[PDB]
């Protein structure tokens, strides 16, 4: 396919969500209009979408949590959606706020997602209120052939409540805008959260390999007392007939766990030629009591954005927990910088869990990565400011007055050097561009007997010796 088929809807949604429910709504749409809706669930659709979106294998509509949609907008991959005020009043104002980017709506919200603590009531009538009291619990449970707690370690969505509990954050939220120069991935509290998790692994209470489906199997087969997961999971648990509760997440250092809250949302592809059909599907078929029930029946959405349908669902205690955990947490930012933050934290947790890096090492890399935008400007500007002084002083100092050869004034890339006489070894303090450079130590540059700067014997390149700058640590 060179282009997206005009006159059908192709829809993309994650494989843990109610995709067969959605296809049912799609079947009703085809009954009324005559146009086929195809629902799909590719792997890593959130990563595939930018690459394929305008290509012709791209979907007409994409479902994902709201955090990825700012980056999608910046890349111009999404249509602006145009619901009138009457439709807007059908959803809660806070949900519309998650899908607003630079003043425009960029997706239709569907549901508010937050992880909760799930537990096996038969094994555990009384769930722990606190993370610190878990290892104790796992010791008892191992004696009885069980594990206390198994959940996805591979994805940082699941480990972020712990990290944020004692003071970790993504980007500082001041003035009603997120400040990307200030990142809370390497602070005291984050270090503390991740350390607790790594210690659970050192003391055998969890296994670093644990991923989404291992942990699901363990809970649903009654091998583990507890799990951490969202409303989508509840279907498969029902099926198993494990007797289960959904409750508040455990406190760490007396502060509650703070999940990042996702608003599952639907965007329309900018390259779709079926945009009004898409709008009609989403507004008149999907976001209805009828429609959301088809989806929630297959796999639960949690707390929905549609006020009418949330009023059916609000009596359910699993929803109340979900909202309680949401309230303790934070609504995700949608800025483009979120893709970098998740990569950072994902990478850190895996490396540390895995044994590859200490916690302080793993996280310092996350801070470097999560805040790449800002650190490139500063690093870059340090250097440029030095270049310009060099250039000014190269223009200002009068000509060499010396009857012999001399190497002339130059900017070497890191430091300024003056006209220097033949056979003279010139020196000055190391620059402070890099964290491993001691500016009490010095740099040499030798001018040869013929008035030419020293060249490296490895490649005859003009070269100043910065070896003392970082040689002692």
């Amino acid at each position: 396919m060179a282009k997206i088929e005009e006159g059908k809807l192709v829809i993309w949604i994650n494989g843990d969500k109610g995709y067969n429910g959605l296809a049912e709504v799609g079947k009703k749409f085809e009954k009324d209009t005559g146009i086929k809706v195809t629902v799909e669930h590719p792997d890593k659709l959130e990563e595939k979408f930018p690459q394929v979106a305008a290509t012709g294998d791209g979907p007409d509509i994409i479902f994902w949590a709201h955090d990825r949609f700012g980056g999608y907008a910046q890349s111009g991959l999404l249509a602006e959606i145009t619901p009138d005020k009457a439709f807007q009043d059908k959803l809660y104002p806070f949900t519309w706020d998650a899908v607003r980017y630079n003043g425009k709506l960029i997706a239709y919200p569907i549901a508010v997602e937050a992880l909760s603590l799930i537990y096996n009531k038969d094994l555990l009538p009384n769930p722990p209120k606190t993370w610190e009291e878990i290892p104790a619990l796992d010791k008892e449970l191992k004696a009885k052939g069980k594990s206390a707690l198994m959940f996805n370690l591979q994805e940082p969505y699941f480990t972020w409540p712990l990290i944020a509990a004692d003071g970790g954050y993504a980007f500082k939220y001041e003035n009603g805008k997120y400040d990307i120069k200030d990142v809370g991935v390497d602070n005291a509290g984050a270090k503390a959260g991740l350390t607790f998790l790594v210690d659970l692994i050192k003391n055998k209470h969890m296994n670093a390999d644990t991923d989404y489906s291992i942990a699901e199997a363990a809970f649903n087969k009654g091998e583990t007392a507890m799990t951490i997961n969202g409303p989508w999971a509840w279907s498969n648990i029902d099926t198993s007939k494990v007797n289960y509760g959904v409750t508040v997440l455990p406190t760490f250092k007396g502060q509650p766990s703070k999940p990042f809250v996702g608003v599952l949302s639907a965007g329309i592809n900018a390259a779709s030629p079926n945009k009004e059909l898409a709008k009609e599907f989403l507004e008149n078929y999907l976001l209805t009591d009828e429609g959301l029930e088809a989806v929630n029946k297959d796999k639960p959405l949690g707390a929905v954005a549609l006020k009418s349908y949330e009023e059916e669902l609000a009596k359910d205690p699993r929803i109340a927990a979900t909202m309680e955990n949401a309230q303790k947490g934070e609504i995700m930012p949608n800025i483009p910088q979120m893709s970098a933050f998740w990569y950072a934290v994902r990478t850190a947790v895996i490396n540390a869990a895995s044994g590859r890096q200490t916690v302080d090492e793993a996280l310092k890399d996350a801070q470097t990565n999560a805040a790449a935008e800002f650190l490139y400007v500063v690093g870059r500007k340090k250097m440029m400011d030095a270049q310009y002084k060099c250039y000014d002083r190269m223009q200002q100092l009068p000509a060499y007055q010396g009857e012999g050869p001399y190497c002339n004034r130059t900017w070497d890339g890191w430091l300024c050097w003056d006209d220097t006489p033949a056979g003279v070894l010139s020196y000055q303090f190391c620059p402070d561009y890099f964290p491993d450079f001691d500016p009490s130590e010095k740099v040499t540059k030798y001018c040869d007997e013929k008035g030419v700067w020293f060249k490296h014997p490895e490649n005859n390149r003009t070269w100043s010796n910065y070896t003392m700058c970082n040689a002692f640590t």
Partner: peptide, 11 residues
């Protein structure tokens, strides 16, 4: 702590 290089090919 990634280690800064000072060899030929730097300044």
């Amino acid at each position: 702590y990634p280690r800064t290089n000072t060899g030929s090919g730097t300044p």
